Amino acid sequence: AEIYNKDGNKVDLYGKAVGLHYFSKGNGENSYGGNGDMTYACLGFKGETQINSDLTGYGQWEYNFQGNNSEGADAQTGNKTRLAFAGLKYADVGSFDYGRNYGVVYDALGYTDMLPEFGGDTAYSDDFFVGRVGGVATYRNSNFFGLVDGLNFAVQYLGKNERDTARRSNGDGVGGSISYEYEGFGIVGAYGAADRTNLQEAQPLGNGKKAEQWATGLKYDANNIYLAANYGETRNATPITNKFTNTSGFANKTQDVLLVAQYQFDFGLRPSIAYTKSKAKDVEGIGDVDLVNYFEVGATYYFNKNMSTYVDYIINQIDSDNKLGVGSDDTVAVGIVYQF
Amino acid sequence: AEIYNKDGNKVDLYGKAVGLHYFSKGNGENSYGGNGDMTYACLGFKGETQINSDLTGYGQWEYNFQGNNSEGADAQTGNKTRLAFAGLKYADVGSFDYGRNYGVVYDALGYTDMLPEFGGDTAYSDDFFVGRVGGVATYRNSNFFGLVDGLNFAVQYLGKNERDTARRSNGDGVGGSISYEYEGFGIVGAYGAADRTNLQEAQPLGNGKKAEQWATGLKYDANNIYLAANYGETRNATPITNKFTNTSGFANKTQDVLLVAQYQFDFGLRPSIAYTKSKAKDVEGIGDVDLVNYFEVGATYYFNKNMSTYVDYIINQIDSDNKLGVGSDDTVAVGIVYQF
Amino acid sequence: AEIYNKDGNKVDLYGKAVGLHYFSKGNGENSYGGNGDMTYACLGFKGETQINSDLTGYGQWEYNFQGNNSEGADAQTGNKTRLAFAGLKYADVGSFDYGRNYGVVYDALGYTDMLPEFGGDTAYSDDFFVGRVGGVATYRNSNFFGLVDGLNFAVQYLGKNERDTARRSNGDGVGGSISYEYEGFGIVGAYGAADRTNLQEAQPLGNGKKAEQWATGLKYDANNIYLAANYGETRNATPITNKFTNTSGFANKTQDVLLVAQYQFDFGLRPSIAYTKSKAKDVEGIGDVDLVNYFEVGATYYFNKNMSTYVDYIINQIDSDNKLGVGSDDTVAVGIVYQF
């Protein structure tokens, strides 16, 4: 909600309270999304100041406050800053920002990341260019310097992040994307390669000294209709765990397909139908193994722009003999969202 | 403070900075409330949107930021989300919300939870239905569907929370309350029973497979006067620790009495007089032992609706030979509160 | 940004998103400021209510959210509340506040704590009276009860803080300051002494039962010019670590000199030139050792009051044979700040 707007500076303080619950049989250990209370709340700000007609400054921070922990020792579990960056937009020359932000490949994956509660399986956090990462410098151009409406691109420099954990670490890398949007249609191609840290390489699964990720996306967004499609691949980038051996590392290779179709009724109901499949190839010891494989049926009802509720049902297609131990049970999310 | 209110959506951003200090002899280890700096600050939001004339959506999140930690490793100690839920209110049909909220028995205990700094001893957190818990679905009706002014009730479903700690865990349960308020008078009855988790049962103290809690309250609230009274009981629900053996678990049984009398002078001074006693029965090994037992004399002065100060003095009646090791020294809290 | 102002109560919600990066050779282990992403964001509030013409209440809380952590286990690293206090200002009698705030000696050190990114080396946190500490009661008088324009003083009572760490602990103490400001000129003297805790005394380095710190400052602040100077000394107060032996404690004695000169161009550019040197004396085992020693060249450009960028370059004068192991490499900070 725009809580401030004077002297060319407007601040938007936003946030949401999400009452959420997951339903899965058993202890949800073998299910797709887990089982039980998953309530949480978000709080963040979006600032934008007009330094003059062509130059705009801006900044954004967003935090995740878990609402399913006790007030005891476990109180902070799951709490984190999602975004934190600042930047400048200049006329038609483009924009540049730095800090914790979305990797460029997400410019692709963003297409299908539209399910009510699940979806966007391949958009992992602190995983190179697919989701939110720290230390990214990002340049973005819109409409090819104003010369070609609908043609956009971005380049992104990822700075090395040596964390205590191989899963949350990364070496330096570069990534870019090109997308074109013409009247309800949109197409994108995104790609990024990077160095893997010593620790990442010291992991049991996966083998290489470079990490790659590219995805393409197609979408039809108009007339209350939303059909989007994604296909991407990766090398030594996708994090995987062998639940049996308790071994971890990255998939040597994965081929990812995400499909989504939705419709927005004028009365507030937005039904959703999706399909996701991500399969690892050449996993040391296992061979080819599905990481994600399901159908999704769900719906969101919007009371207005501030209130809504939804049910997200995952019809898991992963089978019980999945070599890595990926769960095979279904998961049903019900939630009630307030937001400003 | 209502920082936003447009298009039927109003957001209230609130918070307080509390300079606080406890005075107790010794290392406050044997005193009632501890000794030293207890400064803290709170920040939260309360949103409410009018979906139309009969339907209202809403949400609330509230966080506790300890202000007595260093900027070192201990910086996060005591930090937590107190509330986090969303819900809908429909005409005279009632309201329903879900997320982290107050257990139904607190509908009773809330009566005497009015001391300047202490009080509400029996309203523990993550303790079934007495204080704030996670995963509660709560339905509340006011004025019996609009048919009977002053008659209100609530039912509440508690979802199982299996935490690493027996103290912060719980099984599924149900609770409800009925209260009636007629011209300054108010009466309530609250009750809830629930399953105890494996771990809770694996504890040394307490013995059962179900946890119960009920409290009743009477109050006179009018003409600058506030006299409230509470009496409740519990079975295998109250958490207790034997400081000697370092053993823990829950009291098999407790009988709780809380008394409060206060007066609001027109010039801002609100003196307070209270009495609290909670006694455990059949504690394995000890027998009958007082958990809480004191008198309270204190005062709050309100400069205005945003500023105030207070002194809360606990005249501890617990004696030095208390079998569990509950402290016997007095505690005096002084604080200065700014709030918006 | 003043987001609220009604009925004599105004709240100012402020914050900033800082994209920041450090450049140092090697693993920045031997450099002055480290190497890599140092992005972060701040959020805090400042409230002030007019209880009447002479009496003002107020409160302030400020939090630091690190933006260079992953969304994993390390997510909370570096997060902390910087300030948290409440107080009252009465006519010309002065003000008094309590909670986490700035120690009185900082009334001196504040003079030179003006570098774009570095500087204020001696203003440590949770280090008695030099930086932010918890549990400080502070009385401040301005203009000597209104009788002498420009004459100000403060007294401060520090309450004992026994933390798990000797570095973050403190015993009771008292401190005061006197400063005088006449037309662009300002002079200050600050001093404080305190008890050292058992644990602090149990440390290998440093020897005493009392901790002292005093600093004086001179400054010329006018006509776009800023020249400030600080000289202070300490006894058993400055925390020091022997990187070789991995030993820690406090310097028996230190002599600190901080120098700063800056100029604000009308077009937004504020160049900066500074010099800092802090040298420990009588360090058990080493003798005299420099703790900090460098020159600083840097610049800040202000697009407007909400946006800016800067480069801070540290020309480290510490030499590679520094007995304690203090790093000798240079560090260059580049950052882009959005703030409201």
Side-chain angles (χ1 to χ4, degrees):
Chain A
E2 174 162 291
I3 66 169
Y4 189 83
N5 180 10
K6 291 302 172 189
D7 300 318
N9 181 54
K10 59 167 159 288
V11 191
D12 176 353
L13 184 64
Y14 66 87
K16 66 185 178 182
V18 183
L20 184 53
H21 197 93
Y22 282 6
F23 301 92
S24 308
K25 51 182 155 294
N27 196 351
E29 186 182 302
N30 195 238
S31 66
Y32 166 79
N35 169 246
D37 186 40
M38 303 283 309
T39 299
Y40 69 91
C42 290
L43 187 74
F45 76 78
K46 294 196 262 259
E48 187 177 301
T49 178
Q50 280 193 65
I51 298 158
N52 65 52
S53 283
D54 317 306
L55 196 51
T56 297
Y58 63 81
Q60 168 160 210
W61 165 73
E62 184 182 278
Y63 204 93
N64 177 73
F65 294 104
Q66 283 311 129
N68 57 337
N69 297 326
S70 81
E71 292 178 26
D74 61 298
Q76 309 288 327
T77 295
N79 290 5
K80 66 223 176 185
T81 278
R82 288 210 271 261
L83 308 169
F85 63 83
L88 304 152
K89 325 174 199 168
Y90 179 29
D92 287 300
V93 187
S95 60
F96 167 87
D97 52 69
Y98 175 84
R100 190 184 175 81
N101 209 348
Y102 276 102
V104 275
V105 172
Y106 184 86
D107 284 346
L109 306 172
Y111 275 21
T112 56
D113 191 353
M114 302 279 283
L115 308 199
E117 170 63 19
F118 304 106
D121 301 81
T122 72
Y124 304 89
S125 289
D126 311 288
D127 188 51
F128 298 98
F129 304 92
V130 301
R132 298 178 300 272
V133 257
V136 285
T138 302
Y139 167 77
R140 295 190 173 277
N141 184 277
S142 278
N143 304 324
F144 198 75
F145 303 84
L147 300 174
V148 182
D149 290 338
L151 181 58
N152 305 293
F153 73 97
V155 54
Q156 192 185 63
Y157 297 93
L158 176 67
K160 158 182 269 192
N161 281 309
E162 288 190 44
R163 312 211 189 275
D164 312 307
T165 268
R167 161 80 183 75
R168 305 283 166 173
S169 303
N170 78 263
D172 305 303
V174 179
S177 74
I178 302 179
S179 78
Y180 182 69
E181 289 180 47
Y182 179 67
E183 182 182 31
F185 293 96
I187 189 170
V188 220
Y191 174 87
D195 288 331
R196 295 174 88 230
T197 58
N198 275 339
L199 184 51
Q200 282 183 314
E201 296 204 77
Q203 298 308 290
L205 296 169
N207 186 23
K209 301 180 71 72
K210 206 78 178 165
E212 305 180 32
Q213 292 153 341
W214 68 269
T216 71
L218 245 141
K219 70 158 183 173
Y220 179 62
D221 190 351
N223 298 138
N224 302 321
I225 313 172
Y226 190 90
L227 305 180
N230 279 123
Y231 178 71
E233 285 180 29
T234 80
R235 308 297 150 89
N236 301 306
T238 301
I240 63 174
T241 300
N242 186 334
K243 290 184 178 178
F244 302 134
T245 64
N246 279 139
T247 283
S248 306
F250 304 73
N252 282 309
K253 205 289 221 306
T254 78
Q255 301 193 171
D256 320 305
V257 199
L258 293 296
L259 303 158
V260 173
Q262 301 182 357
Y263 186 85
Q264 183 69 54
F265 279 95
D266 281 339
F267 54 93
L269 184 77
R270 165 182 277 259
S272 152
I273 289 301
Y275 171 69
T276 302
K277 180 181 180 182
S278 169
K279 57 172 301 72
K281 294 180 159 58
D282 316 319
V283 174
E284 16 288 281
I286 299 70
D288 290 25
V289 220
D290 279 12
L291 304 177
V292 180
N293 191 351
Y294 67 77
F295 281 91
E296 173 268 341
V297 179
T300 292
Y301 182 88
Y302 299 91
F303 290 97
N304 61 16
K305 62 171 172 183
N306 300 105
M307 203 80 204
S308 77
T309 34
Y310 62 78
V311 194
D312 211 345
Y313 180 29
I314 296 293
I315 296 167
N316 204 342
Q317 302 304 326
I318 288 286
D319 85 288
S320 42
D321 294 339
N322 178 301
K323 302 298 178 182
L324 288 181
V326 176
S328 61
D329 292 331
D330 296 9
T331 302
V332 185
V334 176
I336 163 146
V337 178
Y338 168 78
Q339 63 168 74
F340 65 102
Chain B
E2 174 162 291
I3 66 169
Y4 189 83
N5 180 10
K6 291 302 172 189
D7 300 318
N9 181 54
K10 59 167 159 288
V11 191
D12 176 353
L13 184 64
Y14 66 87
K16 66 185 178 182
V18 183
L20 184 53
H21 197 93
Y22 282 6
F23 301 92
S24 308
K25 51 182 155 294
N27 196 351
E29 186 182 302
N30 195 238
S31 67
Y32 166 79
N35 169 246
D37 186 40
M38 303 284 309
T39 299
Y40 69 91
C42 290
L43 187 74
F45 76 78
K46 294 196 262 259
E48 187 177 301
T49 178
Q50 280 193 65
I51 298 158
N52 65 52
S53 283
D54 317 306
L55 196 51
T56 297
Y58 63 81
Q60 168 160 210
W61 165 73
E62 184 182 278
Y63 204 93
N64 177 73
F65 294 104
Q66 283 311 129
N68 57 337
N69 297 326
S70 81
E71 292 178 26
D74 61 298
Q76 309 288 327
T77 295
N79 290 5
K80 66 223 176 185
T81 278
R82 288 210 271 261
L83 308 169
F85 63 83
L88 304 152
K89 325 174 199 168
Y90 179 29
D92 287 300
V93 187
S95 60
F96 167 87
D97 52 69
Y98 175 84
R100 190 184 175 81
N101 209 348
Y102 276 102
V104 275
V105 172
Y106 184 86
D107 284 346
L109 306 172
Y111 275 21
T112 56
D113 191 353
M114 302 279 283
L115 308 199
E117 170 63 19
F118 304 106
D121 301 81
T122 72
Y124 304 89
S125 289
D126 311 288
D127 188 51
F128 298 98
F129 304 92
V130 301
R132 298 178 300 272
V133 257
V136 285
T138 302
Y139 167 77
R140 295 190 173 277
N141 184 277
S142 278
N143 304 324
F144 198 75
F145 303 84
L147 300 174
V148 182
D149 290 338
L151 181 58
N152 305 293
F153 73 97
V155 54
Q156 192 185 63
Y157 297 93
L158 176 67
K160 158 182 269 192
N161 281 309
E162 288 190 44
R163 312 211 189 275
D164 312 307
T165 268
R167 161 80 183 75
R168 305 283 166 173
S169 303
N170 78 263
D172 305 303
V174 179
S177 74
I178 302 179
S179 78
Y180 182 69
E181 289 180 47
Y182 179 67
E183 182 182 31
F185 293 96
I187 189 170
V188 220
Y191 174 87
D195 288 331
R196 295 174 88 230
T197 58
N198 275 339
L199 184 51
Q200 282 183 314
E201 296 204 77
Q203 298 308 290
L205 296 169
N207 186 23
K209 301 180 71 72
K210 206 78 178 165
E212 305 180 32
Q213 292 153 341
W214 68 269
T216 71
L218 245 141
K219 70 158 183 173
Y220 179 62
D221 190 351
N223 298 138
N224 302 321
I225 313 172
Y226 190 90
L227 305 180
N230 279 123
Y231 178 71
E233 285 180 29
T234 80
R235 308 297 150 89
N236 301 306
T238 301
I240 63 174
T241 300
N242 186 334
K243 290 184 178 178
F244 302 134
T245 64
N246 279 139
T247 283
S248 306
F250 304 73
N252 282 309
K253 205 289 221 306
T254 78
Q255 301 193 171
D256 320 305
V257 199
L258 293 296
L259 303 158
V260 173
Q262 302 182 357
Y263 186 85
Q264 183 69 54
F265 279 95
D266 281 339
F267 54 93
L269 184 77
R270 165 182 277 259
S272 152
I273 289 301
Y275 171 69
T276 302
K277 180 181 180 182
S278 169
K279 57 172 301 72
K281 294 180 159 58
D282 316 319
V283 174
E284 16 288 281
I286 299 70
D288 290 25
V289 220
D290 279 12
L291 304 177
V292 180
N293 191 351
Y294 67 77
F295 281 91
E296 173 268 341
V297 179
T300 292
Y301 182 88
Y302 299 91
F303 290 97
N304 62 16
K305 62 171 172 183
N306 300 105
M307 203 80 204
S308 77
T309 34
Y310 62 78
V311 194
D312 211 345
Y313 180 29
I314 296 293
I315 296 167
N316 204 342
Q317 302 304 326
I318 288 286
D319 85 288
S320 42
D321 294 339
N322 178 301
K323 302 298 178 182
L324 288 181
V326 176
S328 61
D329 292 331
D330 296 9
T331 302
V332 185
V334 176
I336 163 146
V337 178
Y338 168 78
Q339 63 168 74
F340 65 102
Chain C
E2 174 162 291
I3 66 169
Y4 189 83
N5 180 10
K6 291 302 172 189
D7 300 318
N9 181 54
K10 59 167 159 288
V11 191
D12 176 353
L13 184 64
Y14 66 87
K16 66 185 178 182
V18 183
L20 184 53
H21 197 93
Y22 282 6
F23 301 92
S24 308
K25 51 182 155 294
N27 196 351
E29 186 182 302
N30 195 238
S31 67
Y32 166 79
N35 169 246
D37 186 40
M38 303 284 309
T39 299
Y40 69 91
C42 290
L43 187 74
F45 76 78
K46 294 196 262 259
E48 187 177 301
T49 178
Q50 280 193 65
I51 298 158
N52 65 52
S53 283
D54 317 306
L55 196 51
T56 297
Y58 63 81
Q60 168 160 210
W61 165 73
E62 184 182 278
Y63 204 93
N64 177 73
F65 294 104
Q66 283 311 129
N68 57 337
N69 297 326
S70 81
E71 292 178 26
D74 61 298
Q76 309 288 327
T77 295
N79 290 5
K80 66 223 176 185
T81 278
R82 288 210 271 261
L83 308 169
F85 63 83
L88 304 152
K89 325 174 199 168
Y90 179 29
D92 287 300
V93 187
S95 60
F96 167 87
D97 52 69
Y98 175 84
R100 190 184 175 81
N101 209 348
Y102 276 102
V104 275
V105 172
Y106 184 86
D107 284 346
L109 306 172
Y111 275 21
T112 56
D113 191 353
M114 302 279 283
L115 308 199
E117 170 63 19
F118 304 106
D121 301 81
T122 72
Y124 304 89
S125 289
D126 311 288
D127 188 51
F128 298 98
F129 304 92
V130 301
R132 298 178 300 272
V133 257
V136 285
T138 302
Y139 167 77
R140 295 190 173 277
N141 184 277
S142 278
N143 304 324
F144 198 75
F145 303 84
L147 300 174
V148 182
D149 290 338
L151 181 58
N152 305 293
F153 73 97
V155 54
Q156 192 185 63
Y157 297 93
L158 176 67
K160 158 182 269 192
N161 281 309
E162 288 190 44
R163 312 211 189 275
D164 312 307
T165 268
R167 161 80 183 75
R168 305 283 166 173
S169 303
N170 78 263
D172 305 303
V174 179
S177 74
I178 302 179
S179 78
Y180 182 69
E181 289 180 47
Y182 179 67
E183 182 182 31
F185 293 96
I187 189 170
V188 220
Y191 174 87
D195 288 331
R196 295 174 88 230
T197 58
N198 275 339
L199 184 51
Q200 282 183 314
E201 296 204 77
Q203 298 308 290
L205 296 169
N207 186 23
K209 301 180 71 72
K210 206 78 178 165
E212 305 180 32
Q213 292 153 341
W214 68 269
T216 71
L218 245 141
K219 70 158 183 173
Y220 179 62
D221 190 351
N223 298 138
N224 302 321
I225 313 172
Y226 190 90
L227 305 180
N230 279 122
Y231 178 71
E233 285 180 29
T234 80
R235 308 297 150 89
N236 301 306
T238 301
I240 63 174
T241 300
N242 186 334
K243 290 184 178 178
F244 302 134
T245 64
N246 279 139
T247 283
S248 306
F250 304 73
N252 282 309
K253 205 289 221 306
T254 78
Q255 301 193 171
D256 320 305
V257 199
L258 293 296
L259 303 158
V260 173
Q262 302 182 357
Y263 186 85
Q264 183 69 54
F265 279 95
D266 281 339
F267 54 93
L269 184 77
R270 165 182 277 259
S272 152
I273 289 301
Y275 171 69
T276 302
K277 180 181 180 182
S278 169
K279 57 172 301 72
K281 294 180 159 58
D282 316 319
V283 174
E284 16 288 281
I286 299 70
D288 290 25
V289 220
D290 279 12
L291 304 177
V292 180
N293 191 351
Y294 67 77
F295 281 91
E296 173 268 341
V297 179
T300 292
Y301 182 88
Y302 299 91
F303 290 97
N304 62 16
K305 62 171 172 183
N306 300 105
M307 203 80 204
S308 77
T309 34
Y310 62 78
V311 194
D312 211 345
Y313 180 29
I314 296 293
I315 296 167
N316 204 342
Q317 302 304 326
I318 288 286
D319 85 288
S320 42
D321 294 339
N322 178 301
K323 302 298 178 182
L324 288 181
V326 176
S328 61
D329 292 331
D330 296 9
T331 302
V332 185
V334 176
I336 163 146
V337 178
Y338 168 78
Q339 63 168 74
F340 65 102

Coordinates of all heavy atoms in Angstrom, one line a residue, chain B residues 226-255:
Chain B
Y226 N -12.3 -1.5 37.6 CA -12.0 -2.8 37.0 C -11.7 -3.8 38.0 O -10.6 -3.9 38.6 CB -10.9 -2.7 36.0 CG -10.8 -4.0 35.2 CD1 -11.5 -4.1 34.0 CD2 -10.0 -5.1 35.6 CE1 -11.5 -5.3 33.2 CE2 -10.0 -6.3 34.9 CZ -10.7 -6.4 33.7 OH -10.8 -7.6 33.0
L227 N -12.7 -4.7 38.3 CA -12.6 -5.8 39.2 C -12.8 -7.0 38.4 O -13.9 -7.0 37.8 CB -13.6 -5.7 40.3 CG -13.7 -4.4 41.1 CD1 -14.8 -4.5 42.2 CD2 -12.4 -4.0 41.8
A228 N -11.9 -7.9 38.3 CA -12.1 -9.1 37.5 C -11.6 -10.3 38.3 O -10.8 -10.1 39.2 CB -11.2 -9.0 36.2
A229 N -12.2 -11.5 38.1 CA -11.8 -12.7 38.8 C -11.7 -13.9 37.9 O -12.6 -14.2 37.1 CB -12.7 -12.8 40.0
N230 N -10.7 -14.7 38.2 CA -10.6 -16.0 37.4 C -10.3 -17.1 38.3 O -9.6 -17.0 39.3 CB -9.4 -15.9 36.4 CG -9.8 -15.1 35.1 OD1 -9.2 -14.2 34.8 ND2 -10.8 -15.6 34.5
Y231 N -10.9 -18.3 37.9 CA -10.7 -19.5 38.6 C -10.7 -20.6 37.5 O -11.6 -20.7 36.7 CB -11.8 -19.9 39.6 CG -11.5 -21.2 40.3 CD1 -10.4 -21.4 41.2 CD2 -12.2 -22.4 39.8 CE1 -10.0 -22.7 41.6 CE2 -11.8 -23.7 40.3 CZ -10.7 -23.8 41.1 OH -10.4 -25.1 41.6
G232 N -9.6 -21.4 37.5 CA -9.6 -22.4 36.5 C -8.8 -23.6 37.0 O -8.3 -23.6 38.1
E233 N -8.8 -24.7 36.2 CA -8.1 -25.9 36.6 C -7.5 -26.6 35.3 O -8.0 -26.3 34.3 CB -9.0 -26.9 37.3 CG -9.4 -26.5 38.7 CD -10.3 -27.5 39.3 OE1 -10.3 -28.7 39.0 OE2 -11.1 -27.1 40.2
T234 N -6.6 -27.5 35.5 CA -6.0 -28.1 34.4 C -5.5 -29.5 34.7 O -5.3 -29.8 35.9 CB -4.7 -27.3 33.8 OG1 -3.6 -27.6 34.6 CG2 -5.0 -25.8 33.9
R235 N -5.3 -30.4 33.7 CA -4.8 -31.7 33.9 C -3.7 -31.9 32.9 O -4.0 -31.8 31.7 CB -5.9 -32.8 33.7 CG -7.2 -32.5 34.5 CD -7.0 -32.6 36.0 NE -8.0 -31.7 36.7 CZ -9.2 -32.1 37.0 NH1 -9.7 -33.3 36.9 NH2 -10.0 -31.1 37.6
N236 N -2.5 -32.4 33.4 CA -1.4 -32.6 32.5 C -1.2 -31.6 31.4 O -0.8 -31.9 30.3 CB -1.6 -34.0 31.8 CG -1.7 -35.1 32.7 OD1 -0.9 -35.3 33.6 ND2 -2.8 -35.9 32.6
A237 N -1.5 -30.3 31.7 CA -1.3 -29.2 30.8 C -0.3 -28.2 31.2 O 0.5 -27.7 30.4 CB -2.6 -28.6 30.5
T238 N -0.2 -27.9 32.5 CA 0.7 -26.9 33.0 C 2.2 -27.4 33.0 O 2.5 -28.4 33.6 CB 0.3 -26.5 34.4 OG1 -1.0 -26.0 34.3 CG2 1.3 -25.4 35.0
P239 N 3.1 -26.7 32.3 CA 4.5 -27.1 32.3 C 5.2 -26.8 33.6 O 5.0 -25.7 34.2 CB 5.1 -26.3 31.1 CG 4.3 -25.1 31.1 CD 2.9 -25.6 31.3
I240 N 5.9 -27.7 34.2 CA 6.6 -27.6 35.5 C 8.1 -28.2 35.4 O 8.3 -29.3 34.8 CB 5.9 -28.1 36.7 CG1 5.7 -29.7 36.5 CG2 4.5 -27.4 36.8 CD1 5.1 -30.3 37.7
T241 N 9.0 -27.6 36.1 CA 10.4 -28.0 36.1 C 10.8 -28.2 37.6 O 10.5 -27.4 38.4 CB 11.3 -27.0 35.5 OG1 11.0 -26.8 34.1 CG2 12.8 -27.5 35.5
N242 N 11.5 -29.3 37.9 CA 12.1 -29.5 39.2 C 13.5 -29.0 39.1 O 14.3 -29.6 38.4 CB 12.1 -30.9 39.6 CG 12.5 -31.2 41.0 OD1 13.2 -30.3 41.6 ND2 12.0 -32.2 41.6
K243 N 13.7 -27.8 39.6 CA 15.1 -27.2 39.5 C 16.2 -28.0 40.2 O 17.3 -27.8 39.8 CB 15.0 -25.7 40.1 CG 14.3 -24.8 39.3 CD 14.4 -23.3 39.9 CE 13.6 -22.3 39.0 NZ 13.7 -20.9 39.6
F244 N 15.8 -28.8 41.2 CA 16.7 -29.6 41.9 C 17.2 -30.8 41.0 O 18.4 -30.9 40.8 CB 16.1 -30.1 43.1 CG 15.6 -29.0 44.0 CD1 14.4 -29.0 44.6 CD2 16.5 -27.9 44.3 CE1 14.0 -28.0 45.5 CE2 16.0 -26.9 45.1 CZ 14.8 -26.9 45.7
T245 N 16.2 -31.6 40.6 CA 16.5 -32.8 39.7 C 16.7 -32.4 38.2 O 17.3 -33.2 37.5 CB 15.4 -33.8 39.8 OG1 14.2 -33.2 39.3 CG2 15.1 -34.1 41.3
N246 N 16.3 -31.2 37.9 CA 16.3 -30.7 36.5 C 15.4 -31.6 35.7 O 15.6 -31.8 34.5 CB 17.8 -30.8 36.0 CG 18.6 -29.6 36.4 OD1 19.8 -29.7 36.7 ND2 18.0 -28.4 36.4
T247 N 14.3 -32.0 36.3 CA 13.3 -32.8 35.7 C 12.2 -31.9 35.2 O 11.9 -30.8 35.7 CB 12.8 -33.8 36.7 OG1 13.7 -34.9 36.8 CG2 11.4 -34.4 36.2
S248 N 11.5 -32.3 34.1 CA 10.4 -31.5 33.5 C 9.3 -32.4 33.0 O 9.4 -33.6 32.8 CB 11.0 -30.7 32.4 OG 12.1 -29.9 32.8
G249 N 8.2 -31.7 32.8 CA 7.0 -32.3 32.4 C 5.8 -31.4 32.7 O 6.0 -30.2 32.6
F250 N 4.7 -31.9 32.9 CA 3.5 -31.1 33.2 C 2.8 -31.6 34.5 O 3.1 -32.7 35.0 CB 2.5 -31.3 32.0 CG 3.1 -30.9 30.7 CD1 4.0 -31.8 30.0 CD2 2.7 -29.7 30.1 CE1 4.5 -31.4 28.8 CE2 3.3 -29.4 28.9 CZ 4.2 -30.2 28.3
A251 N 2.2 -30.6 35.2 CA 1.5 -30.9 36.4 C 0.3 -31.8 36.2 O -0.4 -31.7 35.2 CB 1.0 -29.6 37.1
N252 N 0.1 -32.8 37.0 CA -1.0 -33.7 36.8 C -2.2 -32.8 36.9 O -3.2 -33.0 36.1 CB -1.0 -34.8 37.9 CG -0.1 -35.9 37.7 OD1 0.0 -36.5 36.6 ND2 0.7 -36.3 38.7
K253 N -2.2 -31.9 37.9 CA -3.4 -31.1 38.2 C -3.0 -29.7 38.8 O -2.1 -29.7 39.6 CB -4.3 -31.8 39.2 CG -5.8 -31.4 39.2 CD -6.0 -30.1 39.8 CE -7.3 -30.0 40.7 NZ -8.5 -30.5 40.0
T254 N -3.8 -28.7 38.5 CA -3.5 -27.4 39.1 C -4.9 -26.7 39.3 O -5.8 -27.0 38.6 CB -2.6 -26.4 38.1 OG1 -3.5 -25.9 37.1 CG2 -1.4 -27.1 37.5
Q255 N -4.9 -25.8 40.3 CA -6.1 -25.1 40.6 C -5.6 -23.7 40.6 O -4.6 -23.3 41.4 CB -6.6 -25.4 42.0 CG -7.0 -26.9 42.1 CD -7.8 -27.2 43.4 OE1 -8.3 -28.3 43.5 NE2 -7.9 -26.2 44.3

